[PDB]
Design a protein around this ligand. Structure first.
Ligand SMILES: *[C@@H]1O[C@H](CO)[C@@H](O)[C@H](O)[C@H]1NC(C)=O
Lengths: 222, 217
C-alpha cells in the first residue's frame, strides 16, 4: 500500500532553514519520482520542484531555485528551504509522480503526503495548557452526553488532538484554533458519547504540540 | 507561465444535483504525442488532495462514476452528475504539460442540505483552570444547517459585549452540517462577581432561541 508519511510541524525564525521529511512506502523510486509543493491557507498551491530519488537529480522552479535543496536517503526524501521569510509560512506537501522510461514524467500527481505545517516566527514557542470540558446535566441531550478538552495558550499552530489513543474518532469535532489578544492560540475539541457509558468507559484527550515538544494526556471524568 | 483559471470560485450545490467546474489555460496543454495533461484533484476539509481525473478524461478505479472530465486545448470541465455529501471540499485543476506545474485558484463546493437544528451544550470552567487565575465557559453548537447561527453570552441577564471567541468547523463530510464553539473568558475575579452564565442561540431550525445556562453553586 502506498504511504507518504511527512515529518512533524516545525517552527523557525526568519533567516533560518527548515528541513522537511517524506518517507515513502508501497512503491519504488525506479518508476516514481517525488514532487514538493506548498500551500498557504488563503492561497492556492505553489509548485516547488521534483527529485529523482535514484540519482538525486533535481529540478527546481525559479522562485525557489536559489534557496531550496531536495535530497534523499533510503526511502526518505528531504526538502530544505533556506533564508526563510514571513510569507514562507505554509503547509508543505510531497507528492508522487509516476515515471515512464519512454516519454518520461507523466504530468500528474497520484499520491500526496499529509503535509507539514511550517511557520516562520521570531517569537518563542509556548506549549499548551489542557483543561477538561466535563460532561454535565447541562451537557446531556437525547440520552447523549458531550465532553471535551480545551487546549489554551500555545504558540504556534498546530496542536493535534486524538481521543483514547485513536480508539475514538466518531462524533469528534476538533474546532479551528482561535487567536487571543495575547497573541496565543486556543482551540476546543469535543465528542458526543452515550450518557449511559459515563461510568464504564474512559475518555482521554491526547494533546500534541510538536513545535514545543509537548504531550498532554488529560482524563475527562463526569 | 501557464496561468490556470477556474470559473465558479464558489459553487453552492444541493444534494442529488449536478455540478460543473471550468478550467482555462493561457496556453495549449497538448504535448508531444497528443497527450493533454490536465488533472482534477479533490481536497476535503482537513485532508490531502486526491486525484479524481487524469489526462482530461481519465478516471482511476476507486474514483466514483459520477465524476467525469472533458474539454480540449485551453478549455476543460469537471462534472459531477449527482452531488453527494463526501463531494464537499475544494477542487483543483493542474497542468502537467510544462514546468512549473500550475494550479487553479480552486473551486469551493459548498454543499446544501435540509435545515438542521443545533445541539446546544455548555461547559463550566475547569477546577485546574480556576487555580491559574482565568475562567473559560464554553458554548457548544453541534451539527446544524445552515451555517448561520447567533450565539449570545448572558451574565445574569446582561448581554456580553467583548469577552468571547468563536469558531466554526468546515462542512461535515457525512451530514453536510456545521459545528460552532464559543469561549467566554474572564479573570477568576470577574468570574466570581456573577452567578448565572448562559448562552442563547438563534438559528433557523429553532422556533424559539435555545438558552443553555449554569449558575455558580
Ligand atoms: C437547499 O436544499 C433544500 C432541500 O431540498 C432546498 O429545499 C432549498 O431550496 C435549497 N436551498 C436553499 C436556498 O434553501
Amino acid at each position: 500500500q502506498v504511504q507518504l508519511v511527512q515529518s512533524g510541524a516545525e517552527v523557525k525564525k526568519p533567516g533560518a532553514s527548515v528541513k522537511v521529511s517524506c518517507h515513502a512506502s508501497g512503491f519504488r523510486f525506479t518508476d516514481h519520482y517525488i514532487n514538493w509543493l506548498r500551500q498557504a491557507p488563503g492561497q492556492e498551491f505553489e509548485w516547488i520542484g521534483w527529485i529523482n530519488p535514484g540519482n538525486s537529480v533535481t529540478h527546481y522552479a525559479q522562485k525557489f531555485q536559489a534557496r531550496v535543496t531536495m535530497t534523499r536517503f533510503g526511502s526518505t526524501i528531504y526538502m530544505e528551504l533556506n533564508r526563510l521569510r514571513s510569507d514562507d509560512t505554509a503547509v508543505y506537501y510531497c507528492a508522487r509522480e509516476p515515471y515512464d522510461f519512454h516519454s518520461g514524467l507523466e504530468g500528474s500527481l497520484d499520491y500526496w503526503g499529509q503535509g507539514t505545517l511550517v511557520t516562520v516566527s521570531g517569537a518563542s514557542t509556548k506549549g499548551p495548557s489542557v483543561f477538561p470540558l466535563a460532561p454535565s446535566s447541562k451537557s446531556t441531550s437525547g440520552g447523549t452526553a458531550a465532553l471535551g478538552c480545551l487546549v489554551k495558550d500555545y504558540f504556534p499552530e498546530p496542536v493535534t488532538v486524538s481521543w483514547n489513543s485513536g480508539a475514538l474518532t466518531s462524533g469528534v469535532h476538533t474546532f479551528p484554533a482561535v487567536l487571543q489578544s495575547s497573541g496565543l492560540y486556543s482551540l476546543s475539541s469535543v465528542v458526543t458519547v452515550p450518557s449511559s457509558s459515563l461510568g464504564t468507559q474512559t475518555y482521554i484527550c491526547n494533546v500534541n504540540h510538536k513545535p514545543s515538544n509537548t504531550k498532554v494526556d488529560k482524563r475527562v471524568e463526569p | 507561465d501557464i496561468v490556470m483559471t477556474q470559473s465558479p470560485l464558489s459553487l453552492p450545490v444541493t444534494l442529488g444535483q449536478p455540478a460543473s467546474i471550468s478550467c482555462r489555460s493561457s496556453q495549449s496543454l497538448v504535448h508531444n504525442y497528443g497527450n493533454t495533461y490536465l488533472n482534477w484533484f479533490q481536497q476535503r476539509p482537513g485532508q490531502s488532495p486526491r486525484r479524481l481525473i487524469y489526462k482530461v478524461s481519465g478516471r482511476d478505479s476507486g474514483v466514483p462514476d459520477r465524476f467525469s472530465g472533458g474539454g480540449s486545448g485551453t478549455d476543460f470541465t469537471l462534472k459531477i452528475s449527482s452531488v453527494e455529501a463526501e463531494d464537499v471540499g475544494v477542487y483543483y485543476c493542474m497542468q502537467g504539460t510544462h514546468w512549473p506545474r500550475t494550479f487553479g485558484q480552486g473551486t469551493k463546493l459548498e454543499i446544501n442540505r435540509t435545515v438542521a437544528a443545533p445541539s446546544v451544550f455548555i461547559f463550566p470552567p475547569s477546577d485546574e483552570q480556576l487555580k491559574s487565575g482565568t475562567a473559560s465557559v464554553v458554548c457548544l453548537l453541534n451539527n446544524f444547517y445552515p451555517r448561520e447561527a447567533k450565539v449570545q453570552w448572558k451574565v445574569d441577564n446582561a448581554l456580553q459585549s467583548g469577552n468571547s471567541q468563536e469558531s466554526v468547523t468546515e462542512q461535515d463530510s457525512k451530514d453536510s452540517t456545521y459545528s460552532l464553539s464559543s469561549t467566554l473568558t474572564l479573570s477568576k475575579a470577574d468570574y466570581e462577581k456573577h452567578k448565572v452564565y448562559a448562552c442563547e442561540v438563534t438559528h433557523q431550525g429553532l422556533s424559539s432561541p435555545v438558552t443553555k445556562s449554569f449558575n455558580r453553586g
